[PDB]
Every structure is written in structure tokens, then in C-alpha cells.
């Protein structure tokens, strides 16, 4: 399930969000993964139990959590799934997790790990997907320096460092919004159907044709009862995408 550091930060950030956090701070060094949390935190009683929620606790793992109605907070150090110890720790309400030397104990899986720059790009892409999906949540990413963005509405412009034209179209159940910037050096086409990102190549080429190439297109779709690769009732969706590319 883990296989690489982007899957670690994915599990930890997903947990942070389920914990109702409005601020997520991710740090990587290429090896440390650290996810700091704004959320409800974990009862001291439950910290051991949740360390055996989080497995990926088998690589050199440390977690501290303070529950929002508790005043202390609790830290547990485990190594390759073996608890090394615990201590009570002063800290703000929330959760911090440090992963540190992923697959130190499993050399063959450690040798599956890519170049450090590749893993850095996978993490960066994941964090910007979470940001583009959650405008109301602050996100921060530390690689060596700082990546940083706050509560917003159009954070598309912050993420992609460009101004954008906003387009809106709605028909039957389908609601979709686009953010487009036409001068780009390279075209980049991002699609989110509901909150889930869609990597489909055919759809991206349809956006290349309908909004033109060498353009940034960020598409947000909302539909109620559909599948998710994913299927829907396609013709009306696609001619809606054409319709709002007609501004
Ligand atoms: Na958590
Ligand atoms: Na400890």
C-alpha cells in the first residue's frame, strides 16, 4: 500500500483532513516525511492502537498527538513496527508524524525508490492537487526551503502563478467551472470531477482542442450519482465543456 513517499504523505494528509484540520504542513528531505496537523488529534489512550490506521509505521516511525479537549499530548516512537517508547509532550492541539528513512529495513523495496528529484515531484504534485481541491484549507510544503498558500477561493492563480479567466456552465445535474490562462509556455490541463483528480488523456486532448494548446486549463466538475478512470453520461458533459469554452 505504501511503496513510496508520496503514498505516505497521501495517507497522512488524508488523515489530517478527516481530523478536520484547516492547516496542513508537509516537509520532506530526500529521508524525512513530516506531516503537521491542525485537527482534533488523537486521544492518548488511542495512540498505540492507531500505530498498530498508520502502518507505514514500519519504517523508523514517530508520532505525537494532542487531543483538542486534552491539555497534554502524547508521543510514541516505534521502529519497524516495534514500539520503542512513549512520553508526554507539550504541543499544540493536533498531530505531527515523522517517517524518516522509509524502507531502511526492507532493502529491495528501498531500491525500488526513484531518484530523489522524482519523489519530490510526486509529492509536490500531490500537495498541489490537495490545495486545488481544498481552497478553504491552508497548505505548506517544505523541500529544502519553502509550497505555501492560505484560505482562498481562487487559489488556482496562486498554485499556477498566473492570472486566470473564470468560466461557468451548468446544465441538468452537471455543474462545471474552469480557470484558463492562454499565454502559457507549456499547456497544462488539470481536471477534477467532483473533488477527485482525473488523469484521462483523451479528456485532456479534448481540452487541448476546445481551449487550444499551450493554455492552462483547470476544470472542476460536479455531478451527483456517478461511478469512479470513471464513467458518467458522457455526451452532455463533453458538449458542456465545449459550451463553456465558448466563454
Ligand atoms: Na490524524
Ligand atoms: Na519517544
Swiss-Prot record:
Function text: This protein is involved in the repair of mismatches in DNA. It is required for dam-dependent methyl-directed DNA mismatch repair. May act as a 'molecular matchmaker', a protein that promotes the formation of a stable complex between two or more DNA-binding proteins in an ATP-dependent manner without itself being part of a final effector complex.
What range of the intact protein is shown?
A: 19 to 308 of 425
User: What are the UniProt keywords, alphabetically?
Assistant: DNA damage, DNA repair
Q: What protein name does the entry list?
A: DNA mismatch repair protein MutL
Q: Which GO terms describe its cellular component?
A: mismatch repair complex
**Which family does the similarity line name?**
Belongs to the DNA mismatch repair MutL/HexB family.
As recorded in UniProt, coiled-coil segments are: none
Which GO molecular function terms does the record list?
ATP binding; ATP hydrolysis activity; ATP-dependent DNA damage sensor activity; mismatched DNA binding
Q: Which domain of life is it from?
A: Bacteria
Q: Which organism is it from?
A: Aquifex aeolicus (strain VF5)
Choose any GO biological process term that the UniProt entry carries and state it: mismatch repair
Amino acid at each position: 500500500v505504501i511503496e513510496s513517499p508520496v503514498d505516505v504523505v497521501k495517507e497522512l494528509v488524508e488523515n489530517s483532513l478527516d481530523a478536520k484540520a484547516t492547516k496542513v504542513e508537509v516537509e520532506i528531505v530526500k529521508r524525512l516525511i513530516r506531516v503537521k496537523d491542525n485537527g482534533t488529534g488523537i486521544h492518548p489512550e488511542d495512540v498505540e492502537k492507531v500505530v498498530l490506521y498508520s502502518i507505514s509505521s514500519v519504517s523508523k516511525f514517530k508520532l505525537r498527538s494532542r487531543f483538542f479537549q486534552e491539555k497534554e499530548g502524547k508521543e510514541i516512537e516505534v521502529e519497524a513496527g516495534n514500539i520503542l517508547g512513549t512520553r508526554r509532550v507539550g504541543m499544540p492541539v493536533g498531530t505531527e508524524v515523522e517517517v524518516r528513512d522509509l524502507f531502511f529495513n526492507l532493502p529491495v523495496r528501498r531500491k525500488f525508490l526513484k531518484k530523489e528529484d522524482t519523489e519530490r515531484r510526486k509529492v509536490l504534485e500531490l500537495i498541489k492537487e490537495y490545495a486545488l481541491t481544498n481552497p478553504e484549507v491552508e497548505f505548506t510544503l517544505f523541500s529544502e526551503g519553502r509550497l505555501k498558500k492560505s484560505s482562498l477561493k481562487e487559489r488556482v492563480e496562486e498554485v499556477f502563478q498566473t492570472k486566470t479567466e473564470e468560466l461557468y456552465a451548468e446544465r441538468e445535474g452537471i455543474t462545471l467551472r474552469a480557470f484558463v490562462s492562454r499565454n502559457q509556455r507549456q499547456g497544462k490541463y488539470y481536471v477534477f470531477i467532483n473533488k477527485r483528480p482525473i488523469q484521462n488523456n483523451n479528456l485532456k486532448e479534448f481540452l487541448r482542442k476546445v481551449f487550444g494548446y499551450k493554455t492552462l486549463v483547470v476544470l472542476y466538475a460536479e455531478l451527483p450519482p456517478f461511478m469512479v478512470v470513471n464513467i458518467l453520461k458522457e455526451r452532455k458533459f463533453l458538449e458542456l465543456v465545449r459550451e463553456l469554452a465558448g466563454k
